Subunit: 301 residues, 2 copies
């Protein structure tokens, strides 16, 4: 345990340039002149993010496996001399962190598992002073990561465990990392949540989605998470919409969090077309035949 | 157990285009008009290889995570209808392989573990007909992958077992798999089962002691040695301060000197040290056993 690390989970902005502007707002405001790391999902993201941050005036350097040894030592020296402020790295990192004053490690995408997020965020605050660990959570990142870690052993479970972390809005972050491996003095984003919480019933929200999928399989169709959301919100190809299913009066990112809820509790299940995720009826959809069964998710009152 | 797959390991050409030409000669040699998969280590590997294969007349398609739905379906559609012959893919694959006639699976780079290689090479021969799984093994691939798997709990040990599979030239390929899985009839469907040679047991203990001199001297010179620098010092090349007086460069080929160091690494006479994606070789946990003048290190070599 590292008591000097403040764990925080933010909602990933759906627009790419809105996301980067928010990062630049943090790099220039809160972290002016402080070294940090930005972890990414692939090598292209690390390069794509580095380009944007550099255009906005941030001294950033990409770091992935396909870097030549000459360019790695370059980023090493410059970042260790604080001449480069942030290394926009990939998972090709971690073990060679002789930097004690890492003040923030932002996650442009969620980690493949909680053990990985502990290691990657663990690069922050090695000097035992205060440091922040931001984790930007996006619905789509669940599926571009799942198809890659599904072939690993228990890898899909290790990702849904990472999803539960980002979904949780009340339990302490350090408890959400500790008991996966089985004294946070208000040092995370959920402990400082003074607000109260309600348990919301979203059972018919689940039965409506099963209507959309049963009809889809009767139409010889497979629904990606976007197609399911679009049909839910009364958009997309009209034949996939179910007559009687009302588009909820909630934000899109709130409907994403509900589908990810049904996924990790296995009311829905993932099916693949190799790097393409399709949502299907899950093993726990059976329990919805009891007219009294109910599904709950914690909201803010 | 897939008894219709011929597993074989080949040495990876250190020259880039020489490797591609070898692959092209195989795609247009016995795999003409046959669908296959080329597995790579990263996204850029798949794109760089896809370009080189295309410019030589091969219908190839890159595939990784940072594609797009419009581009993924296009690859699925083209490649499932035999319009594309090979998909140059990263580990971003899986159960989408409803194609049952994959006839050859080539790994442009070594896998990260034995599970991944049994899973990635398992994309071939789904229709139970004969299919080939050719694994090219390169010394430098150990350290492109090791940086990404050290933080994955037991990723280093799982990669070193994948290296052991590549270093083996006697044990049956299906045997080497099964013992990893704790499982319990190859029918001469692997390269080592089809070998007709006898194998010499060679003592390389002094080769280990010689390298340990090179590493002990590099520490007193305030120097960390990459695997390349360790070999170049061994071969009497590179920086002159880093070669040790009396350590003679062996009369073995370069790739034979890599296999010896790879043996010492996976047997923990040497160990890895990182500067995050830059791997350094250092004295390992078992080099202390070399105080015993009777302790010997051996390696099976061809006769
Ligand atoms: Zn807390
Ligand atoms: Zn055999």
């Amino acid at each position: 345990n590292r008591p000097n690390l403040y764990y925080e989970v933010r909602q990933k902005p759906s627009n790419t340039e809105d996301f980067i502007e928010d990062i630049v707002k943090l790099i220039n405001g809160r972290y002016k002149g402080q070294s940090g790391i930005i972890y990414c999902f692939s090598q292209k993201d690390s390069e794509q993010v580095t380009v944007s941050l550099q255009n906005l005036g941030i001294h950033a350097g990409a770091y992935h496996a396909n870097l030549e040894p000459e360019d790695k030592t370059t980023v090493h020296r410059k970042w260790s001399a604080n001449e480069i402020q942030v290394v926009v790295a990939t998972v090709a990192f971690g073990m060679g962190i002789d930097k004690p004053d890492v003040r923030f490690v932002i996650h442009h995408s969620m980690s493949k598992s909680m053990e990985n997020y502990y290691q990657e965020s663990g690069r922050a605050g090695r000097d035992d002073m205060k440091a922040d660990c931001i984790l930007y959570y996006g619905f789509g990142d669940i599926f571009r990561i799942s198809s890659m870690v599904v072939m690993e052993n228990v890898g899909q479970q290790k990702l849904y465990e990472m999803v539960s972390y980002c979904q949780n809005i009340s339990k302490c972050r350090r408890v959400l990392m500790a008991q996966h491996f089985d004294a946070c003095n208000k040092m995370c984003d959920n402990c400082c949540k003074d607000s109260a919480f309600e348990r919301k019933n979203i059972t018919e929200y689940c039965r409506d989605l099963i209507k959309i999928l049963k009809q889809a399989e009767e139409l010889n169709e497979k629904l990606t998470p976007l197609k399911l959301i679009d049909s839910w919100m009364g958009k997309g190809a009209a034949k996939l919409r179910v007559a009687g299913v009302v588009a909820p009066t909630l934000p899109r990112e709130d409907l994403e969090k509900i589908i990810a809820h049904f996924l990790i509790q296995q009311y829905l299940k993932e099916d693949y077309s190799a790097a393409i995720s399709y949502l299907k009826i899950g093993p726990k959809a059976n329990l919805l035949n009891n007219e009294a069964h109910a599904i709950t998710m914690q909201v803010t009152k």
